[PDB]
Amino acid sequence: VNSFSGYLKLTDNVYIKNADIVEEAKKVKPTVVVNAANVYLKHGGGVAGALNKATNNAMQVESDDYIATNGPLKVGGSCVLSGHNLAKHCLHVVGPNVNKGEDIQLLKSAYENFNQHEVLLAPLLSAGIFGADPIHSLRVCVDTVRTNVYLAVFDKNLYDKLVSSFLE
Ligand SMILES: CCNC(=O)c1cc2c(N[C@H](c3ccc4c(c3)OCCO4)C(C)C)ncnc2[nH]1
């Protein structure tokens, strides 16, 4: 149903909210929820652990069967699988982990995957323990994504910093 509410409009197609992506998925019932994935789809930590626990591990069982046959994704790549109880589909997107020395330039490729979908609920890619500068990730999002993206950032201090910086 894509019933998004309470978002700050940053550009004609990018929106942001201080919210838990799991609670947004339950309220909004989106066509697509984006997971902040890693290449072998191990859904621990961060957004991935939160989404997988909210599916009672159904996402991890489906992801393990996908990886057994298809092997890992690449950094910057993505994979559509079921959204289970949270969405129609989950778009698993791998941003670079700069705290592990991955290439920050591939963050543009990671966001480009969003352009195959008319509307998405998503986290801020490569943030948290992946180490990218959040202000930089929001700029790459705004400059790359053309479809309608609703960003849920579950940290009030980070959200207030991003909004203040974007409005400069
Ligand atoms: C109570 C259950 N819910 C949650 O624990 C939860 C965590 C959430 C989150 N985390 C951000 C993040 C964004 C990209 C990430 C990442 C972490 O980890 C590493 C890979 O990339 C963080 C910067 C605030 N963003 C949005 N909704 C979230 N919900």
Swiss-Prot record:
The domain of life is: Viruses
The Macro domain, residue ranges:
1-168
Oligomer status and interactors: May form homohexamers. Interacts with N protein.
Membrane topology listed for this record: Multi-pass membrane protein
According to its UniProt record, which reaction does this protein catalyse?
Answer: Thiol-dependent hydrolysis of ester, thioester, amide, peptide and isopeptide bonds formed by the C-terminal Gly of ubiquitin (a 76-residue protein attached to proteins as an intracellular targeting signal)
Mechanisms controlling activity: Inhibited in vitro by GRL-0617.
Q: What does this protein do?
A: Responsible for the cleavages located at the N-terminus of the replicase polyprotein. Participates together with nsp4 in the assembly of virally-induced cytoplasmic double-membrane vesicles necessary for viral replication. Antagonizes innate immune induction of type I interferon by blocking the phosphorylation, dimerization and subsequent nuclear translocation of host IRF3. Also prevents host NF-kappa-B signaling. In addition, PL-PRO possesses a deubiquitinating/deISGylating activity and processes both 'Lys-48'- and 'Lys-63'-linked polyubiquitin chains from cellular substrates.
Q: What is this protein called?
A: Papain-like protease nsp3
| Effect ascribed to mutating residue 31 to A | In strain: Mu/B.1.621
Species the sequence originates in: Severe acute respiratory syndrome coronavirus 2
Cell compartment(s), UniProt: Host endoplasmic reticulum membrane
